[PDB]
Amino acid sequence: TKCQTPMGAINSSMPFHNIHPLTIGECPKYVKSNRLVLATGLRNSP
Amino acid sequence: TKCQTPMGAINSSMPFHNIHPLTIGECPKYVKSNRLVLATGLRNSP
Amino acid sequence: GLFGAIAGFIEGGWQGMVDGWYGYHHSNEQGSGYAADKESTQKAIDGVTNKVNSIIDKMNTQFEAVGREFNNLERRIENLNKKMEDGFLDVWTYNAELLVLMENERTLDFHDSNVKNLYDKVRLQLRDNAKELGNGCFEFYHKCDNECMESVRNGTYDYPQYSEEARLKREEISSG
Amino acid sequence: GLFGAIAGFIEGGWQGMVDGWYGYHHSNEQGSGYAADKESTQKAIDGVTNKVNSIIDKMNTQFEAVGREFNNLERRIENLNKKMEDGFLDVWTYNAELLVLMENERTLDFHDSNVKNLYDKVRLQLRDNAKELGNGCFEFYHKCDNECMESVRNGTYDYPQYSEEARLKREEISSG
Amino acid sequence: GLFGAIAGFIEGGWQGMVDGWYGYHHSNEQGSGYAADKESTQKAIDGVTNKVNSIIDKMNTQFEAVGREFNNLERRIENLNKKMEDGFLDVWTYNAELLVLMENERTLDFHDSNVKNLYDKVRLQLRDNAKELGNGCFEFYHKCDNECMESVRNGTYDYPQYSEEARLKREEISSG
Amino acid sequence: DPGDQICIGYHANNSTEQVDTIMEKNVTVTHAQDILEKKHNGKLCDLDGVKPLIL
Amino acid sequence: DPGDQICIGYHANNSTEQVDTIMEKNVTVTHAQDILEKKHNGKLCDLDGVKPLILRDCSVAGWLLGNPMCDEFINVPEWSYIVEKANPVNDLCYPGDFNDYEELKHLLSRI
Amino acid sequence: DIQMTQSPSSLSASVGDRVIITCRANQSIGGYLNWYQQKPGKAPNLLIFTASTLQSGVPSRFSGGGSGTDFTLTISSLQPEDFATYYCQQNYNTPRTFGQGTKVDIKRTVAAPSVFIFPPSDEQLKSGTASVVCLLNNFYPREAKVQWKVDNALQSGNSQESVTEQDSKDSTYSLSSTLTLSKADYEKHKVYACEVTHQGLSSPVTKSFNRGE
Amino acid sequence: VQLVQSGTEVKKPGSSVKVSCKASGVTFSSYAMSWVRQAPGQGLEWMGGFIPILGTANYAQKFQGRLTITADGLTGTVYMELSRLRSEDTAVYYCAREVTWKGASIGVLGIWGQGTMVSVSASTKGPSVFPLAPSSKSTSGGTAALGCLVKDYFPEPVTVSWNSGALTSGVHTFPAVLQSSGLYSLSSVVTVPSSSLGTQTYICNVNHKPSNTKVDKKVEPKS
Ligand SMILES: *[C@@H]1O[C@H](CO)[C@@H](O[C@@H]2O[C@H](CO)[C@@H](O)[C@H](O)[C@H]2NC(C)=O)[C@H](O)[C@H]1NC(C)=O
Ligand SMILES: *[C@@H]1O[C@H](CO)[C@@H](O[C@@H]2O[C@H](CO)[C@@H](O)[C@H](O)[C@H]2NC(C)=O)[C@H](O)[C@H]1NC(C)=O
Ligand SMILES: *[C@@H]1O[C@H](CO)[C@@H](O)[C@H](O)[C@H]1NC(C)=O
Ligand SMILES: *[C@@H]1O[C@H](CO)[C@@H](O)[C@H](O)[C@H]1NC(C)=O
Ligand SMILES: *[C@@H]1O[C@H](CO)[C@@H](O)[C@H](O)[C@H]1NC(C)=O
Ligand SMILES: *[C@@H]1O[C@H](CO)[C@@H](O)[C@H](O)[C@H]1NC(C)=O
User: Counting beta carbons within 10 angstroms of the beta carbon of residue D19, is it exposed (0 to 12), middle (13 to 18) or buried (19 or more)?
Assistant: First the structure.
């Protein structure tokens, strides 16, 4: 793996992760969030 | 000079500077930016 | 929306348009069909792309926690280290969530502005050569073929060309 | 922009208007020339000035890094001191950069709104007494001298005064 | 504001409307009175309430300062502890003030947008059946009773029903 | 006679991805993009091929 | 016949100044204002008319203890700030340790 | 799709000249055009995007303009660094289309080629193959017409040409046409000829050889 | 930032090639990418693209069903996968970032890679050097034309030197040509004086490292 945490590795393919603050390697920046979604399209009509 | 850094004096009528984090005297605030420009006018037509 | 186009006077979107975020649906004697607009689509995709590259790149200096260990007689500094690490993590978590929430609101309003601007772009082109139906459509006071439809879409519609034909139709309708 | 006025239905700015940000260009039998607006410019100037002060002054009470020294057997706290000082420097740099980028977008759209609102201020004053050309210009249906021009620019245009003359011209154009 | 409705072409607000943030004033043969859209007010109230909730407890864990004591020969760490706690307090104070300042700007512009959206909602429903007076009021070309007023207020105005009657009046006014 | 028409509209699809704003929660958008990772393999792998020292 | 006309426009100066936004970079604007200083004179100057204490090849310990190579600093005048090299050659001519040396230097930052 | 056609296909100029390259299309692309410069053995470098705006680092001598279907890339003062191939690309339609390619070439006096023919070697004539090589040496301009004739009969498809790039000293080219036949086809004919039609040749120079020599 | 691609690939017919396009640094990027191929000595050809903010990959007609443009999330890394490879797929494959000094630019390729060369043939084959002897039946004063014919080799490249690097004047080593078989063939002629036909011997050194084929053919004034 390229990023390792005390609970397991992570595919370092996203800017953020919320697994564990103590990381070694090419790791995403750590946040305590449970969800982080960027709206890129427009408001979808039901 | 009015403000001194381990690399040189900064006069800096500007509120921010990026020469060195350690300063003494009446000194502006230190940031790590390479550029900080505030738009005040409007979009200049070519 | 802030600008009142998305879910506003244009009550619903178009499932039939799959090749672009914004576009036109025309209806004339030669038929009907969806078609996407290039100008707003190009600007939006680059605009949203730059917004993503701004939220996602301006975090490389985020606080990277480092494991430090202290003995039983260093509880003060160990507690100081713990509160220092948690504080920075909380600061960046607040920074990350708030930036996403605000930029999500601006992104939806950005799309709303693009639709309204595109509608006003068509509106100011036809002027009184068509009738504003109020539902996101312009009812031409003259014949508008496929070439006429495309001329509207790329900012070339010649108002004087069809002005006289539209004037005759307008006077017929007004007279009763 | 968001409101579609700057670089929108008004395709370009005027190099001939140097004494203001927003203004008018008239053209009647007595000549032509530029004339800047007053209310919009002062409020815009006051708005940006207040905005610049906020970014400049509210960003005070930052982190003032203070040099601290540690010996060979104090590496843990020395690393702690370095990570703490660097972390605050990263946080305020992020805050300073984000503020400028977001405010510049709002500043640019704030000017866009002022142009659009000024255009609608003229549009709603003239109503049908003039014709919306669609490029930021209005064509009067009645004679408008320099005194008439000044009434529109300062919000005191008299619609009923020229209403009868404008109605006579509207019926003539519609009749061909 | 940004959208130019509040303190814009609608010069002032109304003290007679107490049951809602936005609404209408009608004046017909049966009398005059105030009312509310009942939609924009609900959407705004929920949107404003959500914003206020999203600011109140979004900090999650704003830095809670903890008192720590250091002896005479621990001045370096003591100054380090003082700088750390003061640094976090300033960061969160900046976040609190800036969030309130920026969301206050959006909230007022949000109210401005709703008024203009409501104004467009009535302008697009009537189309040519009324005359836009340029100060937030519309003068009908046909008779509009109380039930007709309620149709406009709740988005169910029947344009073709009064279209013929309005066309007769528009013809009379334009003819003189 | 009903004349020819041109209409202005925006995209719509069958996406169910949702986002949150300041004034509104659970807004469905045509295109969204997660930026957060929430999965781990539960192991202790090599770091770029170098085997860790597991005491 | 073409009648009288009035137009609404905006300013357009001759400035090549550029700024950045969230959704766009390098936007040319009519008026901008830098708020960042990036130039320094490269010297060490007096702090409001007070000359700093520049230790040169001597260290703080050698200055205080009276290293014979530091005769320049036997009686220093009032200073504004102390300048010390990272590793001065003249620190402890006789090898040894300076107890609580870092704590003393912290006190010296207020003298 | 939107086919993009460039004009000219290969021009020749010298330092200080004004170079104009016109790129067309079979549909109006509304100012969505870009210009690229490719130097030999290097990745293309962007010069102009949106048909007018210069990319960072591009000298002011490079200029662009146009709208709709006709476009123009202009170099005011050609320097000894702009000699390369220039491509025009559209960014209007999803199937992105490139231009054919215009190669600005150093101008010099016309030089006639030095035609040489080469019968196949006997070592190669031992494994059922026979290659005949015609060499055109140090000519200008690049355009040339090498026609292979076997027993006074024109050939086609059985040839393959390879041209060099302009020499840094004489600024001339060199072409090599290779006729590949099997032993069976080579030994059933006697006269093998190579006809070269070049600007510097008043008449098509023909160098021939016979099988026994 | 810079774009880095994979190394040169020598593939066998009908196989698949995956070429990576990474950026330099730990930075995360959502810029739209484009893959453009260029046949040897031919023009540029757009193969496809990938817009990360849209989550979609656009392909060309002649590549649809054979091409797969993916990305490693937001790391700035994109991949291309061409299947059912043929000799006509031999080209230099480029990846370009759609970005300008104005930021994201969905149409214009601002930052390019270095290119990845792909070669397709059944197996590696050493060259066959055959002398281009000077048939001095004419052009006596017109110096003298002689050279070597390097025929039926794969893959590229082959280095052709003359007289162990001594004879370098007039050496015209032509670029290779992709024959119908899928092998390459190149000729390296050199113009030397006719009077020097006897005194100075002329030998060409041909080296094909991908096959350990080293040839020193002496081009005598053969009959
Ligand atoms: C909007 O208000 C009108 C008026 O209240 C509603 O419709 C009419 O209501 C009157 C009496 O209240 C009835 O006599 C009519 O038969 C009703 N129908 C119509 C078509 O006028 C109308 O329903 C309201 N809006 C909605 C969406 O229901
Ligand atoms: C905005 O434009 C400026 C000037 O054109 C760019 O600054 C330089 O751009 C060149 C070419 O891209 C680089 O080689 C330099 O390193 C840049 N200097 C600095 C200080 O950035 C700038 O990059 C542009 N902004 C972008 C591309 O986002
Ligand atoms: C990485 O992605 C794969 C998808 O093949 C997934 O199975 C795996 O769980 C991911 N990594 C981690 C650490 O979860
Ligand atoms: C301010 O400092 C800079 C950097 O030393 C210098 O170039 C500039 O001249 C100074 N300003 C004045 C007014 O001297
Ligand atoms: C342009 O040329 C291409 C290729 O010949 C063709 O497929 C396409 O239909 C043409 N487009 C137009 C508008 O003529
Ligand atoms: C706009 O459309 C017209 C009609 O299709 C076409 O002739 C023209 O080239 C297009 N582009 C421009 C820039 O006018």
Answer: exposed
Q: Resolution in angstroms for this experimental structure?
A: 3.2
What chain E holds in terms of domains, given with CATH numbers, is 10-166 (3.90.20.10)
Structure tokens at C79: 């507690």
Looking at the DSSP bridge assignments, the partners of residue I126 are none
Give Cβ neighbours of residue D93 (< 8 Å, ≥ 6 apart): B31, B32, B33, C61
Amino acid at B44: N
* Cα separation values, G50 from G53, G81, G82, G83, G99, Å: 9, 9, 11, 13, 31
From the list D68, D116, D159, the residue facing E80 with the nearest CB is: D68
The helix (run of H) or strand (run of E) holding residue C138 is strand C137-140
Q: Pinpoint the alpha helices (H) of E35-158.
A: 40-56, 75-126, 146-153
Protein residues whose CB sits closer than 6 Å to any atom of ligand 5: H 1-3, 26-27
Chain A residues touching C50 at Cβ < 8 A: none
B20 touches B3 (CB < 8 A): no
Q: Write the CB contacts of H202 (distance below 8 Å, at least 6 apart in sequence).
A: none
Mutational test site, ligand 1, from E147, E152, E159, max ligand atoms within 8 Å of CB:
E147
Which among C42, C47, C56 is the nearest to I30, CB-wise? C56
Tell how far the Cα of C29 is from the centroid of ligand 2, in angstroms.
Answer: 52
User: DSSP string spanning F1-55?
Assistant: ----EEEEEEB--S---EE--SS-SSEEBSSEEE-EE----SS---BTTBPP---
Nearest to G6 among D15, D52, D138 (CB): D138
Residue F29 bridge partners (DSSP): A43
The finding on whether G16 has its CB within 6 A of some atom of ligand 2 is no
Minimal-distance CA residue to ligand 1 atom 20: E156
Strand stretches in chain H, DSSP E? 4-7, 12-13, 19-25, 33-38, 45-49, 53-54, 62-67, 70-75, 85-90, 102-103, 105-106, 114-118, 129-139, 145-150, 159-163, 173-182, 191-197, 205-210
Structure determination method: X-ray
Find the closest chain G residue to D55 by CA distance.
G35
What 3 state SS string does chain B have?
CCEEECCEECCCCCCEECCCCCCEECCCEECCCCCCEEECCCECCC
| Interface probe with C: pick from E3, E68, E93, E165, most Cβ of C within 10 Å | E68
B4-25: b (≥16 Cβ within 10 Å) or e: bbeebbbebebbbbbbebbbbb
Protein residue whose Cα sits closest to atom 11 of ligand 4: B11
Residue I42 to residues C117, D53, D160, H83: CA-CA distances in angstroms? 43, 59, 72, 17
Amino acid at position I189, single letter:
V
Query: Ligand nearest H4 Cα, by number?
Result: 5
Q: Give the contacts of C116 (CB within 8 A, at least 6 positions apart).
A: C3, C4, C5, D4
Residues in chain H with CB shorter than 8 Å from the CB of C42 are: 32, 91
Structure tokens at H45: 């470098």
Residue E110 CB partners (closer than 8 Å, separation 6+):
C2, E44, E47, E48, F23
List all residues whose CB is within 6 A of at least one atom of ligand 1.
E 147, 150-151, 154, 156
Using the beta-carbon criterion (under 8 Å), do F7 and C26 form an inter-chain contact? yes
